[PDB]
């Protein structure tokens, strides 16, 4: 923000604001306050406005107001980027605006991939809500409905400078996954750093994994360890699963690739840092982004679903149990065990409940009519959530059309008991529900594309007293 002094043509600066300045105004009889609107053009999926009221005396934020800041997979409704000197990924040129609007409407109507699902996390110790914004995490308190922090978790050109023109084509590191241990004292983050274009190393993405810690009283997460290129070079980490309380008192986690490899990391007190405890070989030449991972509460067995095949691998030997292999009709999207007995496996064409004790599928429900190609691999997992006590929930969203598809959506929540025998509840919401997850209480929280977090859960003295106050 630049204050031009017109008498001498000089200027004063207030740099490193949270976003580009959509609007600016002087608010006060004597110009006491400045009101700003910030945009945060990093998130292309949605336009993230923040209202900043600054004290003109010392240019400090008197009041910063913004709602939840989720990053949806694809742009929603009629979100359009602001106008810039050039057409870039974070902006539109003068000419490109109208064509981009038409293309966006045509994409929303005609195309069949209509994924806007967003990743969100819940802090167990505090029940704060963590949104992995691009290259940063927004910590938001939904009980109070106010933001509590915004922390940069990656390297990159994030607040060092304001990108302009060709610099606006740069892509900052993207926080693909963000998860907490069951204890809640450790934070695990997975990052993808994109190289700059037009170099020899312009096609080799860098995959980073980071372990952070903080005491409960503190508010900032401190990076404790950093793994560069886990699982090898240019190999993503598709899935992250924090360990149960039984194993290592919740100081472990598994990372799973698209090559079928698994790596188990744990916090070693002697080394004082996280080290790779166990490894599985991703040697075979089969690739798939559809990878799901579940762990028994006891910690004895781990369920690894790669492409169409599910494997029961023992933790001790970190290998197939000595039936371990289960073939499925289509690719596995999410594997979750509502209870130690019942394992609920969702494939791209159906969802099934199986008894590990009997090894026999109990119930199977068709999903193909609703989920055929709407979502990319792995996002049905962030749609399906499970309680550890009562049961799970299936979320199914439909476009509404009367006489070609229309922009508005309708969402349906279905509460299922363990093994899916009965539908405990059936509710309808009037908007696309991006993400639904289980708060550690009985209630479930869900996030709307309108950025709304709903919850599904179970005398003379008297006269003188008045007048004196008036005076």
């Amino acid at each position: 923000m630049s204050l031009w002094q017109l008498e001498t043509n000089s200027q004063q600066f207030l740099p490193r604001l949270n976003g580009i300045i959509i609007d600016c105004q002087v608010l006060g009889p004597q110009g006491n306050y400045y009101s700003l609107i910030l945009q945060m053009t990093e998130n292309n999926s949605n336009s993230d406005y923040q209202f900043l009221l600054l004290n003109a005396s010392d240019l400090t934020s008197k009041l910063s107001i913004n709602g939840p800041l989720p990053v949806f997979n694809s742009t929603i409704k009629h979100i359009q980027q602001p106008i810039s000197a050039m057409n870039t990924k974070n902006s539109n040129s003068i000419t490109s605006l109208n064509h981009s609007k038409k293309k966006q409407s045509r994409k929303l109507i005609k195309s069949r991939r209509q994924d806007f699902t967003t990743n969100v996390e819940i802090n167990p110790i505090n029940k704060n809500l963590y949104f992995p914004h691009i290259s940063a995490v927004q910590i938001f308190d939904f009980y109070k409905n106010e933001q509590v922090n915004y922390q940069y978790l990656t390297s990159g050109v994030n607040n060092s400078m304001g990108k302009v023109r060709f610099e606006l084509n740069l892509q900052d590191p993207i926080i693909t996954d963000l998860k907490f241990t069951k204890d809640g004292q450790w934070m695990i983050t997975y990052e993808i750093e994109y190289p700059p274009n037009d170099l020899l190393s312009s096609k080799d993405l860098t995959h980073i994994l980071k372990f952070w810690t903080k005491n409960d009283n503190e508010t900032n997460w401190n990076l404790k360890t950093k793994v560069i290129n886990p699982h090898g070079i240019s190999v993503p980490i598709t899935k992250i699963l924090p360990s149960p309380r039984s194993v290592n008192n919740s100081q472990g986690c598994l990372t799973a690739d698209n090559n079928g490899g698994l790596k188990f990391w744990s916090f070693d007190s002697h080394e004082s840092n996280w080290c790779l405890k166990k490894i599985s070989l991703p040697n075979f030449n089969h690739f798939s982004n559809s990878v799901s991972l579940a762990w028994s509460q006891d910690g004895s067995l781990i369920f690894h679903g790669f492409d169409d095949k599910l494997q029961i691998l023992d933790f001790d030997t970190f290998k197939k149990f000595e039936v371990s292999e289960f073939t499925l009709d289509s690719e596995i999207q999410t594997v979750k065990l509502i209870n130690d007995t019942n394992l609920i496996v969702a494939t791209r064409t159906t969802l099934n409940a199986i008894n590990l004790l009997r090894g026999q599928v109990i119930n199977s429900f068709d999903l193909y009519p609703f989920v055929n190609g709407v979502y990319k691999n792995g996002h049905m997992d962030r749609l399906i959530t499970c309680d550890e006590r009562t049961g799970n929930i299936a979320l199914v969203i439909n476009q509404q059309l009367t006489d070609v598809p229309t922009i508005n959506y309708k969402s349906r929540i279905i509460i299922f008991d363990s093994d899916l025998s009965t539908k405990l509840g059936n509710f309808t919401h009037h908007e696309y529900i991006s993400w639904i997850g289980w708060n550690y209480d009985t209630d479930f929280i869900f996030l709307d594309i309108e950025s709304t977090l709903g919850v599904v859960g179970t005398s003379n003295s008297d006269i003188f007293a008045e007048q004196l106050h008036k005076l």
């Binding site: 020899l200 401190n222 990076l223 360890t225 090898g232 790779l276 405890k277």
Partner: protein, 140 residues
């Protein structure tokens, strides 16, 4: 800050006179770097083969660890020290096969060898470009 950077390939926590086998065994057992360094100073390949040939299989494993750390810290020794590593694997290969764990004990070799090989595709790309420009002005 003071965080530790690491990688996913670090599997650490998962015949003739003139042979210097006598000095090598003593140096490895006592971790005497100076005594070890004199042994590695010999470059005659005939010596290198014979010393490792008579060296006890139990001590061979720790020799691989010592060479790996020296190669990782100093890249210029990658050449002369490799022949030690190559002969250790050839001679003590049978013993190395029958060990309960190799990744934890040879973690230093795997990390060091893995690092160099990963640069291989890039260096070919640079070499082709350098040849292209080198060819051009040489003919002109």
């Amino acid at each position: 800050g003071n965080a530790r950077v690491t990688s996913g390939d670090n599997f650490k926590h998962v015949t003739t006179t003139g042979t210097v086998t006598v000095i090598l065994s003593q140096a490895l057992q006592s971790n005497d770097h100076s005594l070890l360094e004199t042994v590695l100073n010999n470059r005659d390949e005939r010596v290198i083969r014979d010393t490792i040939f008579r060296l006890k299989p139990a001590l061979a494993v720790i020799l691989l660890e010592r060479l790996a750390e020296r190669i990782a810290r100093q890249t210029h020794r990658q050449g002369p020290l490799n022949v030690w590593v190559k002969w250790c694997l050839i001679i003590h290969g049978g013993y190395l096969v029958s060990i309960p764990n190799l990744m934890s004990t040879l973690s230093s070799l795997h990390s060091t060898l893995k690092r160099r090989s990963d640069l291989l595709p890039r260096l070919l790309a640079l070499d082709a470009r350098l040849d292209c420009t080198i060819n051009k002005f040489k003919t002109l």
